[PDB]
Symmetry: C3
Subunit: 226 residues, 3 copies
Amino acid sequence: LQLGELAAAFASVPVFPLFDAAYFIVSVLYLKYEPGAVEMSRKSPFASWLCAMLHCFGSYILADLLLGESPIHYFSNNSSVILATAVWYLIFFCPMNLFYKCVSFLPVKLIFVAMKEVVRVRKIAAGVHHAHHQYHHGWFIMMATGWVKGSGVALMSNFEQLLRGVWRPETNEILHMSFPTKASLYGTVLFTLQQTHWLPVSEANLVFFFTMFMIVCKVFMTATHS
Amino acid sequence: LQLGELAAAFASVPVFPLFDAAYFIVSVLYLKYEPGAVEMSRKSPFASWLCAMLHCFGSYILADLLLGESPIHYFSNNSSVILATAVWYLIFFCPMNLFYKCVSFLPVKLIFVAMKEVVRVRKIAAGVHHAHHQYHHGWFIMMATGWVKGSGVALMSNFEQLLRGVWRPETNEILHMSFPTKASLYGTVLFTLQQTHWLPVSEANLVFFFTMFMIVCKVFMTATHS
Amino acid sequence: LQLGELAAAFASVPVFPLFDAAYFIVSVLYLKYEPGAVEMSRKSPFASWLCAMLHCFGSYILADLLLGESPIHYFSNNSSVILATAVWYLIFFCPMNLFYKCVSFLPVKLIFVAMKEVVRVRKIAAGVHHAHHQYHHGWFIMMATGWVKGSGVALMSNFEQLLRGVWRPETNEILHMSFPTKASLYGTVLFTLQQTHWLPVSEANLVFFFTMFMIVCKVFMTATHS
Ligand SMILES: [Br-]
Ligand SMILES: [Br-]
Ligand SMILES: [Br-]
Ligand SMILES: [Br-]
Ligand SMILES: [Br-]
Ligand SMILES: [Br-]
Ligand SMILES: [Br-]
Ligand SMILES: [Br-]
Ligand SMILES: [Br-]
Ligand SMILES: [Br-]
Ligand SMILES: [Br-]
Ligand SMILES: [Br-]
Ligand SMILES: [Br-]
Ligand SMILES: [Br-]
Ligand SMILES: [Br-]
Ligand SMILES: [Br-]
Ligand SMILES: [Br-]
Ligand SMILES: [Br-]
Ligand SMILES: [Ca+2]
């Protein structure tokens, strides 16, 4: 019936396990595309796994570092870690590469890309709210925390590369923001303004509309450069 | 009348906003002199701003990292962040470059350099005292914390460079300490000895004399290689 | 009489000062062998000392970083820091290089290598137990913490190099684990399984047998490539 009331259901969909799985699948597919990633999975499987955990848990790691909490606090969520580990294992080692083939099938891939954005927006909003809880007027801390929750491993890409034995210092995601990093920055500003009560919208409505924006943008981009 | 009583007034001058402004002006001028900095402000203004915040808040960031606190805790001081942001904006984007011209005028520049040293010494002493509060006999933690409060962004210079897309690993400020880094190390030893009660001087008198030493050294150096 | 009762004495030998000294001696000998280390001790003695502290306190530094504690918390143990500092000073600056000559004498060196492994295993077990205390079911945090307590400075080797002015990003200890790093990973899994109560052995017996394994392996390796 009511929109802000469908918005409430949208903004509270349980992200574990299905939306988290989609987030992991899309993120580990991106890892498998990186130069040298398949050979690394064969010669250095622990590091390859460590790399997938970053792609999977980089948002949490970086937010925890910014706020002074254990950077591996999120790895206490055993079920999530094991689910991400299963995704890594299936994408790199499934017989016949069958799992890769199924999740890369473009209609399926686009649904996972859409689901990944649901998770990303929830993470941005959670970062703003968690920072606000610790710093009620900490606008810059709220923005920084929402930003790294959204952007994830991209903001640590120089060190994800280092882990892989790669060093490209000429560029980084702050000096040259990719679209998801820039979108996450706009998103964190919006959620911080909503948290400040200067943006006159319900949090659920902001989640709904910003998620739809990210879904449309990301699905379009995936479908176009396929 | 009494010196240790003028020393008390000296050591308690309110550093916000005027001495902090001078600290920011001198530090962002240094940023503007770094290779590529003006072009970065035009092509990557967020990163340029991020870079100025490091120059501005590197002391706090590093001390917080050493002590296990949020490395962005200091960014909860909204007024300070906004003041530093105004300084960055004026130095890089003022029409006619007028702000740069005024603050670079050598007599004005030297006064800001003097004021910057007032802030630096207060920060060193505060780092020793804050570490002492957490570790009453933690001599090495007191020295480490006073040192990074004094030295600031210089000790993270390899990563300030990385942010700018620059990587010079051959050298760093520990392997080859510049004068302010070395002076900050001597300063942190003195304040730690004062805190230990092995150096028989009042804290205010130590602040006065060490600040005068840094002012004389820094103003001489600025005026000479102008 | 009883083995698990000799195991109790073995697992509770006071590591300070003698086993810690051996740990420091072996670790700083390794530092002195690294390219450029002697010249660095003459031209950059503070950084050389800073480097020895990493070799000495890297386990604690990294575990503290992983758990969100002060990375220099361990430097509050003044006696340990001063003992490590004496070892650094004697190894690099003793007249006639006499201390180096004595501790490098192969029978003496092998005893110190054995003693170093006693300390390493105790550190792994302590890391698992300390992580368990904070996260009763935090299996991945327990493994990560035991691993860096065992592996020590090796896992930060890229940044130990950076401190020395060296940058080799092609390789790292996760992508290509050395034997002690890999052994520490196996060790942390065993202690975590013991902590979980899935490995039916007393903690003291596990300490005894895993320490004997590391002693045999490390003494063999030192004696062979001497
Ligand atoms: Br790459
Ligand atoms: Br491996
Ligand atoms: Br979240
Ligand atoms: Br969060
Ligand atoms: Br408050
Ligand atoms: Br992405
Ligand atoms: Br530079
Ligand atoms: Br930008
Ligand atoms: Br301060
Ligand atoms: Br402080
Ligand atoms: Br105490
Ligand atoms: Br300076
Ligand atoms: Br090397
Ligand atoms: Br030195
Ligand atoms: Br320990
Ligand atoms: Br520990
Ligand atoms: Br619990
Ligand atoms: Br070793
Ligand atoms: Ca902390």
